[PDB]
Design a protein around this ligand. Structure first.
Ligand code: E6H
Ligand code: E6H
Ligand code: ZN
Length: 258
């Protein structure tokens, strides 16, 4: 009876196995754009993905991860609110059954169709497993998806999904360039939070970009053909793999822009 996104194992149940679900810095949150304060002391983000080495795509039963070689400083996130150098390990999405829901963060209560998470770990902690035990261990770059024009740089991801339909399936996924998933502007909001899935560890500096990327209805329809189940198990579409907004508590969301 493992955690998931169903009636019987979804976000309202997670606190029984993961009591930090009711913690002081849980994610996601609603971003109240009028309350977020411009912090003129933040720096421009530095997103340096030129040397990225993608390896593999995995359906883990909750989402799909595009995994990177993080055994060297290749693809790194620095600057903005961050102290030091954060190495890209994987990206994944959260998405809806319908275009009107799917994002985890909201903006003035607006839900986007999906949300991309580019996961990075602080290299001062040596490995990802050590980094998730630290309050500044991860930096996740969150990018909203709206449905309109296709995103050409997403199509290589879309077109491999039929090969990882079910939980535990993986496929080689080399030479994928995550720069093709970024919007034009790196204006962002930032706050201290958590993983949005179990184990819900409070180890994340969130950096949520203001500008969404546009994807086509056909692109997101292909996300929605994935399965939560394993091969040879009843088909359960992988949709609505998002956690709703959690209490902000004693936190401030800072803006990089006026
Ligand atoms: C996950 C999955 C299964 C079967 C077909 C598709 C298409 O892209 Se069409 C995707
Ligand atoms: C379980 C886990 C590990 C690393 C990152 C996440 C998210 O971005 Se949500 C979740
Ligand atoms: Zn995520």
């Amino acid at each position: 009876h493992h955690w998931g996104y169903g009636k019987h194992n979804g976000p309202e149940h997670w606190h029984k196995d993961f009591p930090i679900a009711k913690g002081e810095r849980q994610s996601p949150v609603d971003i109240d754009t009028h309350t977020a304060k411009y912090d003129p002391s933040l720096k421009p983000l530095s997103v340096s993905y030129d040397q990225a080495t993608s390896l593999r795509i995995l359906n883990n039963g909750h989402a799909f991860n595009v995994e990177f070689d993080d055994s060297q400083d290749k693809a790194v996130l620095k600057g903005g609110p961050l102290d030091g150098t954060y190495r890209l390990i994987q990206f994944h999405f959260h998405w809806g059954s319908l275009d009107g829901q799917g994002s985890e963060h909201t903006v003035d209560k607006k839900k986007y169709a999906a949300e991309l998470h580019l996961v990075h770990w602080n290299t001062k902690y040596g490995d990802f497993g050590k980094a998730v035990q630290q309050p500044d261990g991860l930096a996740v770059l969150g990018i909203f998806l709206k449905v309109g024009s296709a995103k050409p740089g997403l199509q290589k991801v879309v077109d491999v999904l039929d090969s990882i339909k079910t939980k535990g399936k993986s496929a080689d996924f080399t030479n994928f360039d995550p720069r093709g998933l970024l919007p034009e502007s790196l204006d962002y909001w930032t706050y201290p939070g958590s993983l949005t899935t179990p184990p819900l560890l409070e180890c994340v500096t969130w950096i949520v970009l203001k500008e969404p990327i546009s994807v086509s209805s056909e692109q997101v329809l292909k996300f929605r053909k994935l399965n939560f189940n394993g091969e040879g198990e009843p088909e359960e579409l992988m949709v609505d793999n998002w956690r709703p907004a959690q209490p902000l508590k004693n936190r401030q969301i800072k803006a990089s822009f006026k």
